[PDB]
Amino acid sequence: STGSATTTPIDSLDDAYITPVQIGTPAQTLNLDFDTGSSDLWVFSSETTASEVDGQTIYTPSKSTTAKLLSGATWSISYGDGSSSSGDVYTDTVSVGGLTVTGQAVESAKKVSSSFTEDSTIDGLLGLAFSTLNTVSPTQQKTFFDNAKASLDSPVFTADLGYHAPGTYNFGFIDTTAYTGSITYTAVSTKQGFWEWTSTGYAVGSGTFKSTSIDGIADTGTTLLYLPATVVSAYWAQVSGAKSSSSVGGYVFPCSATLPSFTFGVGSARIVIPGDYIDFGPISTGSSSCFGGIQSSAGIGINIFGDVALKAAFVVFNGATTPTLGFASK
Ligand SMILES: Cc1noc(C)c1CN(C)Cc1cc2n(n1)CCN(c1cc(N)ncn1)C2
Numbered sequence: 266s267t268g269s270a271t272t273t274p275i276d277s278l279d280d281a282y283i284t285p286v287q288i289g290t291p292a293q294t295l296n297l298d299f300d301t302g303s304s305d306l307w308v309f310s311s312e313t314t315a316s317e318v319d320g321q322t323i324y325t326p327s328k329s330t331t332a333k334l335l336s337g338a339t340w341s342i343s344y345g346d347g348s349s350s351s352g353d354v355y356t357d358t359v360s361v362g363g364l365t366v367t368g369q370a371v372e373s374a375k376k377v378s379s380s381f382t383e384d385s386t387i388d389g390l391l392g393l394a395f396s397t398l399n400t401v402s403p404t405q406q407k408t409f410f411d412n413a414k415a416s417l418d419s420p421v422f423t424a425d426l427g428y429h430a431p432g433t434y435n436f437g438f439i440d441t442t443a444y445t446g447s448i449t450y451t452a453v454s455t456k457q458g459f460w461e462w463t464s465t466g467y468a469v470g471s472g473t474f475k476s477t478s479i480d481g482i483a484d485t486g487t488t489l490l491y492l493p494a495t496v497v498s499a500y501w502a503q504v505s506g507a508k509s510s511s512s513v514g515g516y517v518f519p520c521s522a523t524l525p526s527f528t529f530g531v532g533s534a535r536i537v538i539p540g541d542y543i544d545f546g547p548i549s550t551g552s553s554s555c556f557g558g559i560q561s562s563a564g565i566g567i568n569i570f571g572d573v574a575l576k577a578a579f580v581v582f583n584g585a586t587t588p589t590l591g592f593a594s595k
Pocket of ligand 1: 280281298300301302303344345346348380381383384387390484485486487488
């Protein structure tokens with residue numbers, strides 16, 4: 266089997282991407298944030314505290330003839346930005362882009378933090394990291410991809426995120442028309458539960474490539490590119506007036522700037538992030554200070570190849586017995 270679904274930016278800045286997911290019988294379609302940095306499929310639901318729901322579409326398990334309470338199971342998650350959610354668990358039928366899993370754990374939120382409530386465009390998360398990170402207790406549950414894997418034509422999924430435009434998540438096949446050149450594959454460590462890999466270096470604009478190992482994670486659920494402070498300083502030094510602002514929480518730059526590209530290495534191959542992908546717009550409405558898309562990972566404890574990086578590539582998440590990642594230009 267295979268599946269293919271379009272993923273759409275939630276706003277004009279690509280602050281996140283949403284993909285429609287069918288849950289239950291009859292189907293209830295929710296728009297979920299596909300997140301290769303976490304491993305829980307959780308949704309706003311009829312159980313979510315009413316004051317914490319503001320415009321999201323909810324899953325109502327009592328209206329699904331295939332939903333079953335997973336007795337005694339609870340979940341609770343915190344994300345890198347300080348947001349959180351928690352609740353109980355059902356199993357139900359879940360379909361993405363025509364690919365169906367029966368008995369998928371659907372984690373129903375009883376509580377969500379303010380950043381979820383305040384974002385009416387995201388109805389939940391669909392985790393695509395390794396199932397070892399799943400938070401369900403006392404019986405850890407499998408991700409949608411792990412449940413689907415054996416049925417897929419090939420044990421892979423691909424992320425093809427758009428810049429200020431829709432893109433595609435495919436399951437079970439590699440669309441050879443969706444990229445240019447060849448796909449370069451690189452080793453993955455699953456020891457922290459992530460799609461963790463080592464980039465071979467970077468370049469800023471037309472500058473020379475610096476060969477240096479940068480360990481980090483391929484994370485579709487993180488908006489920006491978080492890299493070591495040395496690398497990030499080298500990038501923003503090429504932008505007149507750019508500075509790190511403690512009050513704003515990272516590097517900002519004059520909105521009048523034209524930004525240089527940023528290149529990262531995948532083995533001997535190179536992925537070029539165009540400068541415009543690094544512009545996240547005014548820090549507040551009407552400001553001429555703009556927020557940068559490349560930020561320091563210092564204090565986060567891991568480097569994160571988030572959407573800013575991944576949207577410049579066609580990315581293969583190869584879930585073979587020894588997982589690997591593939592990157593192609595597009
Ligand atoms: C509105 C709005 N505008 O810009 C943003 C961002 C939002 C909030 N909106 C995106 C809501 C939200 C907050 C989170 N998500 N979705 C996804 C899960 N979270 C992660 C995952 C992960 N792998 N890494 C980090 N966090 C935190």
